[PDB]
Amino acid sequence: PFLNSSNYAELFNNDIKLFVDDTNVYRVTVHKTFEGNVATKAINGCIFTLNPKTGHLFLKIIHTSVWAGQKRLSQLAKWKTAEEVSALVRSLPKEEQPKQIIVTRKAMLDPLEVHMLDFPNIAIRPTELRLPFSAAMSIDKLSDVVMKATEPQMVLFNIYDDWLDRISSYTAFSRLTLLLRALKTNEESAKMILLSDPTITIKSYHLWPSFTDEQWITIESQMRDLILTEYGRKYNVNISALTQTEIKDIILGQN
């Protein structure tokens, strides 16, 4: 069955699950060539693999060298993604392997299915939620680590920093999706919100600023305002009349 806003709560039980997003695997940049002309040039990408309960993020960096001399790159990127995900699962002991892998794009369903045939007990699931994981490259530390890569490599992070010491996984997932949705809606303004009080810093081993509990409330309130203001302007609707569930649907990307 599909993961949707009606059953996503299962992402927080004890059955190990991993989200896999390939949106940032194949990337290009536009620059001016030595002749004064303009062209696209491949740049490093990444496979976003996240455990929503523990916050563990397996960031597989895709180096431009993999595109080198290859054809049908859109196909190669999808199979390359399934290749790396299964290699990761294969390296993990049975007790740490996921019961299910949820793909953010249905196009990844088949390639991954083929590659996971070595693990009969691992279910591959599609989702109706158009999650904001692509915004991952808007998180400076992740973008930089990806950018500096001079060769293939995997880097691990806890996308929830140390939040689980004080809030539940369900609450942490809500905070993360809200942040990523805002980054995706208006990156400039979202980063502005996050960086408006330099006294609140980002630990070397974290991705987000060390906001206190009271500050997170104000931050989440502003991030939500940013998103809903945009929504209201576009659809010409009264934001203050939206139900909590409708707001949640916008954040998670349901429909």
Swiss-Prot record:
Q: Which cysteines are joined by disulfide bonds?
A: none
Specify the species.
Saccharomyces cerevisiae (strain ATCC 204508 / S288c)
Task: Locate the transmembrane regions by residue number.
Answer: none
* Top-level taxon of the source organism: Eukaryota
Instruction: Please provide the record's free-text comment about the domains of this protein.
Output: The MPN (JAB/Mov34) domain has structural similarity with deubiquitinating enzymes, but lacks the residues that would bind the catalytic metal ion.
**Assembly mode:** Component of the U4/U6-U5 tri-snRNP complex composed of the U4, U6 and U5 snRNAs and at least PRP3, PRP4, PRP6, PRP8, PRP18, PRP31, PRP38, SNU13, SNU23, SNU66, SNU114, SPP381, SMB1, SMD1, SMD2, SMD3, SMX2, SMX3, LSM2, LSM3, LSM4, LSM5, LSM6, LSM7, LSM8, BRR2 and DIB1.
The record's subcellular location field reads: Nucleus
Q: Extra info from the record?
A: Present with 468 molecules/cell in log phase SD medium.
Q: Mind telling me what this protein is named?
A: Pre-mRNA-splicing factor 8
Q: What is the effect of changing residue 22 to A?
A: Reduced growth at 30 degrees Celsius. Strongly reduced growth at 16 degrees Celsius. Strongly reduced growth at 35 degrees Celsius
Q: What is the stated purpose of this protein?
A: Functions as a scaffold that mediates the ordered assembly of spliceosomal proteins and snRNAs. Required for association of BRR2 with the spliceosomal U5 snRNP, and the subsequent assembly of the U4/U6-U5 tri-snRNP complex. Functions as a scaffold that positions spliceosomal U2, U5 and U6 snRNAs at splice sites on pre-mRNA substrates, so that splicing can occur. Interacts with both the 5' and the 3' splice site, as well as the branch region. Has a role in branch site-3' splice site selection. Associates with the branch site-3' splice 3'-exon region. Also has a role in cell cycle.
Residue span of region RNase H homology domain: 7-255
